[PDB]
Design a protein around this motif. Structure first.
Motif, PDB file in Angstrom:
ATOM      1  N   UNK B   1       4.829   4.279 -10.049  1.00 55.08           N
ATOM      2  CA  UNK B   1       5.467   4.689  -8.755  1.00 55.08           C
ATOM      3  C   UNK B   1       4.477   4.497  -7.607  1.00 55.08           C
ATOM      4  N   UNK B   2       4.686   3.450  -6.774  1.00 55.62           N
ATOM      5  CA  UNK B   2       3.589   2.910  -5.980  1.00 55.62           C
ATOM      6  C   UNK B   2       3.365   3.550  -4.610  1.00 55.62           C
ATOM      7  N   UNK B   3       4.336   3.430  -3.706  1.00 53.85           N
ATOM      8  CA  UNK B   3       4.092   3.678  -2.296  1.00 53.85           C
ATOM      9  C   UNK B   3       4.371   5.117  -1.960  1.00 53.85           C
ATOM     10  N   UNK B   4       3.477   5.697  -1.165  1.00 58.05           N
ATOM     11  CA  UNK B   4       3.654   7.048  -0.647  1.00 58.05           C
ATOM     12  C   UNK B   4       5.043   7.151  -0.023  1.00 58.05           C
ATOM     13  N   UNK B   5       5.340   6.160   0.815  1.00 59.87           N
ATOM     14  CA  UNK B   5       6.631   5.988   1.471  1.00 59.87           C
ATOM     15  C   UNK B   5       6.962   4.488   1.339  1.00 59.87           C
ATOM     16  N   UNK B   6       8.219   4.190   1.010  1.00 60.31           N
ATOM     17  CA  UNK B   6       8.612   2.908   0.394  1.00 60.31           C
ATOM     18  C   UNK B   6       8.608   1.726   1.346  1.00 60.31           C
ATOM     19  N   UNK B   7       9.015   1.986   2.586  1.00 53.57           N
ATOM     20  CA  UNK B   7       9.009   0.997   3.661  1.00 53.57           C
ATOM     21  C   UNK B   7       9.813  -0.256   3.282  1.00 53.57           C
ATOM     22  N   UNK B   8       9.125  -1.374   3.056  1.00 52.61           N
ATOM     23  CA  UNK B   8       9.743  -2.699   3.076  1.00 52.61           C
ATOM     24  C   UNK B   8       8.865  -3.728   2.348  1.00 52.61           C
ATOM     25  N   UNK B   9       9.425  -4.920   2.184  1.00 47.60           N
ATOM     26  CA  UNK B   9       8.649  -6.139   1.984  1.00 47.60           C
ATOM     27  C   UNK B   9       7.777  -6.329   3.228  1.00 47.60           C
ATOM     28  N   UNK B  10       8.461  -6.343   4.378  1.00 48.82           N
ATOM     29  CA  UNK B  10       7.915  -6.625   5.715  1.00 48.82           C
ATOM     30  C   UNK B  10       6.503  -6.090   6.019  1.00 48.82           C
ATOM     31  N   UNK B  11       6.396  -4.825   6.436  1.00 44.74           N
ATOM     32  CA  UNK B  11       5.125  -4.193   6.827  1.00 44.74           C
ATOM     33  C   UNK B  11       4.498  -4.852   8.065  1.00 44.74           C
ATOM     34  N   UNK B  12       3.830  -5.992   7.876  1.00 46.82           N
ATOM     35  CA  UNK B  12       2.944  -6.573   8.899  1.00 46.82           C
ATOM     36  C   UNK B  12       3.731  -7.098  10.100  1.00 46.82           C
ATOM     37  N   UNK B  13       3.450  -6.541  11.274  1.00 47.07           N
ATOM     38  CA  UNK B  13       4.195  -6.865  12.486  1.00 47.07           C
ATOM     39  C   UNK B  13       3.714  -8.212  13.017  1.00 47.07           C
ATOM     40  N   UNK B  14       2.412  -8.300  13.274  1.00 50.78           N
ATOM     41  CA  UNK B  14       1.809  -9.447  13.953  1.00 50.78           C
ATOM     42  C   UNK B  14       0.283  -9.285  14.005  1.00 50.78           C
ATOM     43  N   UNK B  15      -0.462 -10.407  14.099  1.00 52.82           N
ATOM     44  CA  UNK B  15      -1.889 -10.309  14.372  1.00 52.82           C
ATOM     45  C   UNK B  15      -2.152 -10.081  15.852  1.00 52.82           C
ATOM     46  N   UNK B  16      -3.217  -9.342  16.127  1.00 53.01           N
ATOM     47  CA  UNK B  16      -3.644  -9.057  17.481  1.00 53.01           C
ATOM     48  C   UNK B  16      -4.401 -10.275  17.976  1.00 53.01           C
ATOM     49  N   UNK B  17      -4.093 -10.687  19.201  1.00 48.36           N
ATOM     50  CA  UNK B  17      -4.689 -11.871  19.802  1.00 48.36           C
ATOM     51  C   UNK B  17      -5.366 -11.446  21.099  1.00 48.36           C
ATOM     52  N   UNK B  18      -6.690 -11.353  21.047  1.00 51.87           N
ATOM     53  CA  UNK B  18      -7.497 -10.898  22.174  1.00 51.87           C
ATOM     54  C   UNK B  18      -8.952 -11.346  21.958  1.00 51.87           C
ATOM     55  N   UNK B  19      -9.852 -10.933  22.849  1.00 51.25           N
ATOM     56  CA  UNK B  19     -11.220 -11.436  22.858  1.00 51.25           C
ATOM     57  C   UNK B  19     -12.089 -10.732  21.841  1.00 51.25           C
ATOM     58  N   UNK B  20     -11.773  -9.483  21.506  1.00 54.92           N
ATOM     59  CA  UNK B  20     -12.511  -8.736  20.498  1.00 54.92           C
ATOM     60  C   UNK B  20     -12.221  -9.276  19.109  1.00 54.92           C
ATOM     61  N   UNK B  21     -10.949  -9.602  18.872  1.00 52.26           N
ATOM     62  CA  UNK B  21     -10.471 -10.036  17.565  1.00 52.26           C
ATOM     63  C   UNK B  21     -11.056 -11.388  17.179  1.00 52.26           C
ATOM     64  N   UNK B  22     -11.100 -12.293  18.150  1.00 49.08           N
ATOM     65  CA  UNK B  22     -11.662 -13.622  17.955  1.00 49.08           C
ATOM     66  C   UNK B  22     -13.140 -13.535  17.556  1.00 49.08           C
ATOM     67  N   UNK B  23     -13.880 -12.647  18.213  1.00 53.18           N
ATOM     68  CA  UNK B  23     -15.279 -12.441  17.905  1.00 53.18           C
ATOM     69  C   UNK B  23     -15.466 -11.793  16.552  1.00 53.18           C
ATOM     70  N   UNK B  24     -14.593 -10.849  16.201  1.00 48.71           N
ATOM     71  CA  UNK B  24     -14.637 -10.210  14.887  1.00 48.71           C
ATOM     72  C   UNK B  24     -14.275 -11.127  13.728  1.00 48.71           C
ATOM     73  N   UNK B  25     -13.495 -12.166  14.019  1.00 45.25           N
ATOM     74  CA  UNK B  25     -13.204 -13.203  13.033  1.00 45.25           C
ATOM     75  C   UNK B  25     -14.502 -13.924  12.612  1.00 45.25           C
TER      76      UNK B  25
END
Lengths: 246, 91, 61
Positions: B1-25
């Motif tokens: 019995x896996x998920x605390x709360x079942x949610x979806x296949x989906x989950x991931x909305x989108x990647x964040x696209x900004x100047x901090x994220x590019x540097x952290x990559x």
RNA sequence: GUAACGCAAACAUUGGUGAGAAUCCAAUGCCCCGAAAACCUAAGGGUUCCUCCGCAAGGUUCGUCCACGGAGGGUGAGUCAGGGCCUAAGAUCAGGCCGAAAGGCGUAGUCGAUGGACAACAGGUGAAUAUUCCUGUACUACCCCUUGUUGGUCCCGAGGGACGGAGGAGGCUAGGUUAGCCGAAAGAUGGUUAUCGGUUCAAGGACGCAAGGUGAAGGGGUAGAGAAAAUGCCUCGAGCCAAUGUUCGAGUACCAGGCGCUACGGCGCUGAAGUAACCGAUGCCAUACUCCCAGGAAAAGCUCGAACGACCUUCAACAAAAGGGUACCUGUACCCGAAACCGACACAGGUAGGUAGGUAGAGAAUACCUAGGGGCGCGAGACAACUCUCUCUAAGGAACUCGGCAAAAUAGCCCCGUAACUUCGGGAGAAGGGGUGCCCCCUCACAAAGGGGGUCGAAGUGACCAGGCCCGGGCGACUGUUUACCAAAAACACAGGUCUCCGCAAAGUCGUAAGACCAUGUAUGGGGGCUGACGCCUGCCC
RNA sequence: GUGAAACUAAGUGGAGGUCCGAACCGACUGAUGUUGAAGAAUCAGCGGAUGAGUUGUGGUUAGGGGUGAAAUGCCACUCGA
RNA sequence: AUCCCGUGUGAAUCAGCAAGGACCACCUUGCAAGGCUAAAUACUCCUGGGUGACCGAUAGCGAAGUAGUACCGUGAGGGA
RNA sequence: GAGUUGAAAAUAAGCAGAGAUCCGGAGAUUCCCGAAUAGGUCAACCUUUCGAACUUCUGCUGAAUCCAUGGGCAGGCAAGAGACAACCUGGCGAACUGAAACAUCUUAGUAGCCAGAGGAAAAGAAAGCAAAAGCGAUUCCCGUAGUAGCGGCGAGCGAA
């Protein structure tokens, strides 16, 4: 030690509703609870005293017994007894200080204590420091006892009683000496009647200093204190009582 | 019995696209994403690993004060996040 | 003075305030349940102020 | 077009920005805070945090600036905090009792930290987060495999967790100072290097304890319903318990200073010495020691263990070993001795805890300072009365006045000296006097001692700081409490005294009732009336 | 110093609702404030300051009520309800 | 009187029992101590259709604007 | 049957005569909280073993005693629970006021709280009215009538 248990009721001037029914309580010092076998119903098992210690929850001292088979109980310390003395509960057993035995087989006129009123319960009478009962007579089903109050009372003869007077006779020789001593003993101040307002107490009000003006001395709740009986009327035990007190 | 709360296949909305994220990559070798508020670390790591076929040294997540969960998804020294993220339109 | 005066409020944990006036409290008592009846009846947006989440953002651990 | 513009810490200049600057930014001065006006937390706020833009409104003035308006961003955890563990006060309460209804009592349990139980430190980075990201070095909990034993697991019976206040001595460290060592050094004036800086390193692993304490800590079998606790047997390189300390962690860094950047911010290369002495905590040893009485939580985790009663059982449960491999939820921004919480205000107010530098000093007081932080969001003049916050005052010295109210004076330390009365503890710092700065000396041990001698000032605790004292009476014995926001007392309380009730299914109290307190107490106890330490007393009237 | 107690000189000891005095808690006197800086403050002094002490957190008691070292005081700037 | 109730008593059965405003007699009327039952009647958070010697932004619902909002209050609650 | 993709209305891409957008009837889905119901909780979360909790239905069992009851394990679309303006039924039940004061009395069985259910509810098929003449279960309007009455014979109340 599995006899010294921190299982207080807490607050301990307050009822179920949560109001101060028993008055002038609180402050105090934190204290624990020593269970004490007032029944002394470990029958025909020979016991040995080991230590006399301070019960914070009493006047009289408590005595730690070790039994021959190997178990321990707390009891009331009798007057003459010391460390390393010997006791036993049962039917036969001698009349040596601190032994336990039913009232039937006991001598006429002996200083005793811890007496049951009803067989089975435990031990209700003569429990304080210096408590002492003196068996006056016996009659059929009953034994006729004189209590520490100075009252003669029929109780059932099969009932239990521990021989000897109860120890620590000198605890009347305190002076306390200061407000603070009674304050940390658990008790709290007692405001007089005549001082208060009329709304609070019957004696209340009065301009200047008040004389107790209303024909009688009254309680807070109207019922003449200072002379007036209050022993229900036709109570179940009425028959058994022989005398008054002093 | 896996998920605390079942949610979806989906989950991931989108990647964040900004100047901090590019540097952290480049620096940490790590992706940055917005997920479900009811998304778990375990859930994210099972998703992203099982999606791209890549390993996940660790995920670390926070809830930005509006109430949308953003997750740093760190990757092993083996797998290369710069070139991986290049083929998901961040570079 | 050094004791401040006639500030009825202080800064007190939302735990205690939610256990005194919160939803779960009002909902238990029959008398208090009919207060929520009046509140939905009047149509007030926020029924009972002083409610907290056990979860984050406004958690009082 | 007046009163006001929220302390009397305090500003000044040069340059910059711009339509415009006392007020925005930079520099230089100067000044103020420093048991804060410093830096962290808890609560609470709830986006105020950072960036770029704007200045209608808001800001007690202005304003290019902002906790304001617009636009975009920002809070990273196995180990920090909470929950997934545990229970207290208290809450709710299955069955059960009691009640017109609503409901009340109450056990089993279940919640409920402010408490127990548990695993991480340094350095680094960056507009805004860092014990969370980076580097190094750690630790807790699980799944592998090598040995194994035959059962495990829960219930269950024990050990243990496990607890007070006060005081004192010892051993240590954190921190400080001084020296040494190393580098730097013109600070424009008689002299002068006597100058200025740096001298640092955590968690964890391995290992030993002294004129520190003590002289059974830790075991092994045995009887008797008895596996633990308890009645008798022996045995202990006669020793244990700890904080510090030696090493690795750490041939790494960290590092004072030098050598190059190019415009408004830090950043590349280099890199010396890295020790000693003394002072020393309210920190640790210590849940230690002594003393005292008012007699000092629970429950789980943990360790035993024999049962009985159930389950899970031969692709398994418990023990140990290196090396692996693995790692849930929520909080994390910012203010937090406040212009962001609480006081309607950017209000002279309130607000739990943590860290505690130097010089002087007994000191967390005071004064001046360091680190760090600030100059109080109207200014410019002028120098009338009057008011306030202060400073002094010839001669007198309470003549003031309801009243010495207010002001003044006293003051630290050392030495001498100290009365009536007394409950023999006091009164008492009684009263009253003398000495104190600076320099130089005697001493196999008197914190600039003690003593001797000099020298300066009108004045030596020179500043801040820091008792005025005495005699006689009323009331209350006394410390204490009280009218928040006009009354602090002679009022209440108090130890002590006396009376009266109550024999336990107790009197009393609260409830329609059940039942709760009393009390897990029982007459040396419990309830009520009055009096109010202590001394001598307390008469007449039913 | 005694038959031993009693009693008395010096050491040791650290009691105390003990003393002086910061933090802490209070609120005696004055001055200031009175369309205040503040709907009780500022300033200068004041009492306690190891206890009947102060205080954080989490709780309990409810209006024909509660609580009260007792003023009819307090119970959310409200109290003879 | 009639109807219903706590306490205690305590009948009869159609040659009966109860009522006819104490009570008795005679008449008359009915059958108590088991149940069920539409309509006409009451009302408006509300839907559709119609009407107004009703209001017209200080009126009309509190509310003609994203009102029980802003705001105040610990809270019930108040309220533009 | 012709243009649409909610309001403010701008863009981007779609769907539309092989018939959309729309309008109506019937179905399907319906995160979390809330009677809340797997357990906890500080409503909108946390823990799980992933479960309608609890009661009467219904299958088995087997306590202290034979039977029985409590209890335990099962299957269950599984009936009940909560909400709801007024009206209504039942339970409890004020006081101000009026009487020129006030206690009988009046306010009133009203307001309030509590429980319950429907479109109405309650009543209801004579142990009834009435008078020697008759009527035939209720309920509501007109009326009798402010009459008969009751009432510190006061204030008032007032039938059939």
């Amino acid at each position: 030690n599995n006899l010294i248990s921190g299982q207080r009721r807490c607050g301990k001037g307050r009822n179920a509703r949560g109001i101060i029914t028993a008055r002038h309580r609180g402050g105090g010092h934190k204290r624990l609870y020593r269970k004490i076998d007032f029944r002394r119903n470990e029958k025909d098992i020979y016991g040995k005293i080991v230590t006399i210690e301070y019960d914070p929850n009493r006047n009289a001292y408590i005595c730690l017994i070790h039994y021959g088979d190997g178990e321990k109980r707390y009891i009331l310390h009798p007057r003459g007894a010391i460390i390393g003395d010997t006791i036993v509960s049962g039917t036969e057993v001698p009349i040596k200080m601190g032994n336990a035995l039913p009232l039937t087989d006991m001598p006429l006129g002996t200083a005793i204590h811890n007496i049951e009123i009803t067989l089975g319960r435990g031990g209700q009478l003569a429990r304080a420091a210096g408590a002492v009962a003196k068996l006056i007579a016996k009659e059929g089903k009953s034994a006729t006892l004189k209590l520490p109050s100075g009252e003669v009372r029929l109780i059932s003869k099969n009932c239990s009683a521990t021989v000897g007077q109860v120890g620590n006779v000198g605890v009347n020789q305190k002076r306390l000496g200061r407000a603070g001593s009674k304050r940390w003993l658990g008790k709290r101040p007692v405001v007089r009647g005549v001082v208060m307002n009329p709304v609070d107490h019957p004696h209340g009000g009065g301009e200047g200093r008040a004389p107790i003006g209303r024909k009688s001395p009254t309680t807070p709740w109207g019922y003449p204190a200072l002379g007036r009986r209050s022993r229900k009327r036709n109570k179940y035990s009425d028959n058994f009582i022989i005398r008054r007190r002093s | 019995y896996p998920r605390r709360i079942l949610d979806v296949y989906q989950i991931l909305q989108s990647p964040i696209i900004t100047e901090a994220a590019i540097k952290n990559i480049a620096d940490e070798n790590s992706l940055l994403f917005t997920v479900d508020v009811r998304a778990d670390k375990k859930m994210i790591r099972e998703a992203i690993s099982n999606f791209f076929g890549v390993k996940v040294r660790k995920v670390n997540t926070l809830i930005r004060p509006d109430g949308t969960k953003k997750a740093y998804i760190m990757l092993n020294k083996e797998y290369n996040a710069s070139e991986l993220a290049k083929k998901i339109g961040i570079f | 003075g050094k004791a401040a005066l006639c500030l009825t409020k202080r800064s007190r944990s939302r735990k205690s305030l939610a256990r005194t006036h919160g939803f779960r409290l009002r909902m238990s008592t029959t008398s208090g349940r009919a207060l929520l009846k009046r509140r939905r009846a009047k149509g007030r947006k926020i029924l009972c102020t002083k409610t907290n989440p056990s979860s984050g953002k406004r958690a009082s651990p």
